Design a protein around this ligand. Structure first.
Ligand code: A1ACB
Ligand code: A1ACB
Ligand code: CL
Ligand code: CL
Ligand code: CL
Ligand code: CL
Lengths: 123, 4, 123, 4
């Protein structure tokens, strides 16, 4: 018999992004080819199968720095981190291959799906 | 607010 | 020129609630008349003007335990904590006064608004 | 996915 507030999830995500932009309560640095990205472990876990596996590990859950595979493109990661905190994906002809490869590595199934669809349309 |  | 994934914010909140239910990466205990509630500081801040003010304070941001005012009803808090993580509010004739009072104290404006409206309809 |  609950009532539901339609905009609540979007408002929560908007506030989490405001905290990220002001570097409030960020608890991890993600290192991508020497580029550094500060974030909240819980948000990373909520969006990515890879971060979910990492931060549920009894040793890695306590790390303040995570280094990604050197093949990962920092721009592709940045676009995906922005998507995690906003639901908005900056998908462009020039970045789609790097974004799809990064989403496959991060295990972000819905992003992989739209990249596959956009690539298929261009062939 | 809605009835979900 | 971004594309947007409609269900992303809801999916993020659903995963944050899954972490809460399994007590994963919870970093604070909220004490309400001896009842204890584990949660994520970022989610509490994203939903409540009171928690936002508390955890942006340079001393309180580091506390692992927060004690609420003794007038706060634990059931009212529990219903609001559930709403924070799900967008669903269990509003009933028997709890509406405790829920509204708790939402006013927590500074959850949209919850206060629907409680005021539901009370006005019954008079 | 939509055009926001
Ligand atoms: C599976 S239960 C669960 N519980 C809590 C969290 Cl934080 C979580 N996250 C997560 C797991 C897998 C995947 C994603 C997020 C995005 C994606 O495409 N795959 N999962
Ligand atoms: C105001 S900027 C901002 N930036 C980040 C966060 Cl985490 C935040 N939360 C917050 C503040 C006030 C209120 C709520 C959440 C719910 C409500 O009714 N009032 N606010
Ligand atoms: Cl470390
Ligand atoms: Cl995704
Ligand atoms: Cl403490
Ligand atoms: Cl609210």
């Amino acid at each position: 018999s609950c009532i539901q507030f339609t905009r609540h999830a979007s408002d929560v995500l908007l506030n989490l992004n405001r905290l990220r932009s002001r570097d409030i309560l960020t608890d991890v640095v993600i290192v991508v080819s020497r580029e550094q990205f500060r974030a909240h472990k819980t948000v990373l876990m909520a969006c990515s199968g890879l971060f979910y596996s990492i931060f549920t590990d009894q040793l890695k859950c306590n790390l303040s720095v995570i280094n990604l595979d050197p093949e990962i493109n920092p721009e592709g990661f940045c676009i995906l981190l922005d998507f995690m905190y906003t639901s908005r994906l900056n998908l462009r002809e020039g970045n789609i291959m790097a974004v799809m490869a990064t989403a496959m590595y991060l295990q972000m199934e819905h992003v992989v799906d739209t990249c596959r669809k956009f690539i298929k349309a261009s062939e | 607010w809605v009835i979900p």
